[PDB]
From Swiss-Prot:
The gene is EGLN1. Changing C14A: Little change in enzyme activity. One of its GO terms (cellular component) is intracellular membrane-bounded organelle. 2-oxoglutarate binds at R196. Residues 104-205 form the Fe2OG dioxygenase domain. Its cofactor is Fe(2+); L-ascorbate. The beta(2)beta(3) 'finger-like' loop domain is important for substrate (HIFs' CODD/NODD) selectivity. One of its GO terms (molecular function) is zinc ion binding. Changing R184H: In ECYT3; decreased interaction with HIF1A and EPAS1 and decreased enzyme activity. Disulfide bonds: none annotated. This is Egl nine homolog 1. Its EC number is 1.14.11.29. Changing D67 to A/K: Reduced C-terminal ODD domain (CODD) hxdroxylation of HIF1A. It catalyses: L-prolyl-[hypoxia-inducible factor alpha subunit] + 2-oxoglutarate + O2 = trans-4-hydroxy-L-prolyl-[hypoxia-inducible factor alpha subunit] + succinate + CO2. The chain holds residues 188 to 403 of 426 of the full protein.
Length: 216
C-alpha cells in the first residue's frame, strides 16, 4: 500500500482512537527478508552489545544478560535496507503530519535494533517517555518469520491507561507497530525463548522536544 492511503485511512484514525496501531505486511517478503539478513549479519559480526544485565551474580560468569542492542543511522555499510525501512517509516509519518493528536513531528531518533537472545529474558513493564523527553510516537518493525508465541513467547503486552485489559502484539515478520510513547502505553516484552529481532525509532513532537532542552 502506498501508505498515504495507509496513513490517512488507517493509521491516523486508529491512533486518535486507540493510540496503538498495527500494520501487517508493511514492506513485503523480499524487502523484509533483506532487512532480516542485514540485522542477522550485524548480530553475527558482533555489532550488538552483550545484553542488558538482568541478574548480576558475585561470580560474573553466571551473569544473565537480556536484550542486546545497536544504534543504526541507516547509512552504515550493510545497513542500506534498514535505512530504507527508516525512510519508509519517515514517509508514513510525514503524511500523518498534523493529524496525530495535536503533535507536530519534526524529527526522530536513530534506529534501535534490538535482539532478545532467546534465553528466557524479556523486558520489564515500563513507559517509553514518562518524563517529557520529546518522544511522542514509538514505531516498531518486527523481523520474526513464522513466529509462534505459544512456543517462543516474546509477546509485546501493552497496558492501555484507564482500560481493564491487555493489548497483546506478536513480534511478527514485516509487522509495523505505532503507539503513543507516553504514560498512555505502559508495556512489557514477555520472556522470549527464541531469538527475537525488532527495529525501533521514536518520533519527536516539536514543542515537547523544544522545551525538553532546558529540562535537560
Ligand atoms: C531493547 N528494548 C526494547 O525492546 C524496548 C521495547 O519496549 N520493546 C518492545 C518490543 O520489542 O515489542 C524498549 O522500550 C527499550 C528501551 C530502551 C532500551 C532498550 C529497549
Ligand atoms: Mn518500550
Amino acid at each position: 500500500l502506498p501508505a498515504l492511503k495507509l496513513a490517512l485511512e488507517y493509521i491516523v484514525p486508529c491512533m486518535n482512537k486507540h493510540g496503538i496501531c498495527v500494520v501487517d505486511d508493511f514492506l513485503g517478503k523480499e524487502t523484509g527478508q533483506q532487512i532480516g539478513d542485514e540485522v542477522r549479519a550485524l548480530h553475527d559480526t558482533g555489532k550488538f552489545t552483550d545484553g542488558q544485565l538482568v541478574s548480576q551474580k558475585s561470580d560474573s560468569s553466571k551473569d544473565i544478560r537480556g536484550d542486546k542492542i545497536t544504534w543504526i543511522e541507516g547509512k552504515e555499510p550493510g545497513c542500506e535496507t534498514i535505512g530504507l525501512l527508516m525512510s519508509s517509516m519517515d514517509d508514513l509519518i510525514r503524511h500523518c503530519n498534523g493529524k496525530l493528536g495535536s503533535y507536530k513531528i519534526n524529527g526522530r531518533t536513530k534506529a534501535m535494533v534490538a535482539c532478545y537472545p532467546g534465553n528466557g529474558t524479556g523486558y520489564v513493564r515500563h513507559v517509553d517517555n514518562p518524563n517529557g523527553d520529546g518522544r511522542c510516537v514509538t514505531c516498531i518493525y518486527y523481523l520474526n518469520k513464522d513466529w509462534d508465541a505459544k512456543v517462543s513467547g516474546g509477546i509485546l503486552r501493552i497496558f492501555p491507561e484507564g482500560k481493564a485489559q491487555f493489548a497483546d502484539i506478536e513480534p511478527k515478520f514485516d509487522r509495523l507497530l505505532f503507539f503513543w510513547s507516553d504514560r498512555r502505553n505502559p508495556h512489557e516484552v514477555q520472556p522470549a525463548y527464541a531469538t527475537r529481532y525488532a527495529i525501533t525509532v521514536w518520533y519527536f513532537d516539536a514543542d515537547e522536544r523544544a522545551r525538553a532542552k532546558v529540562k535537560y
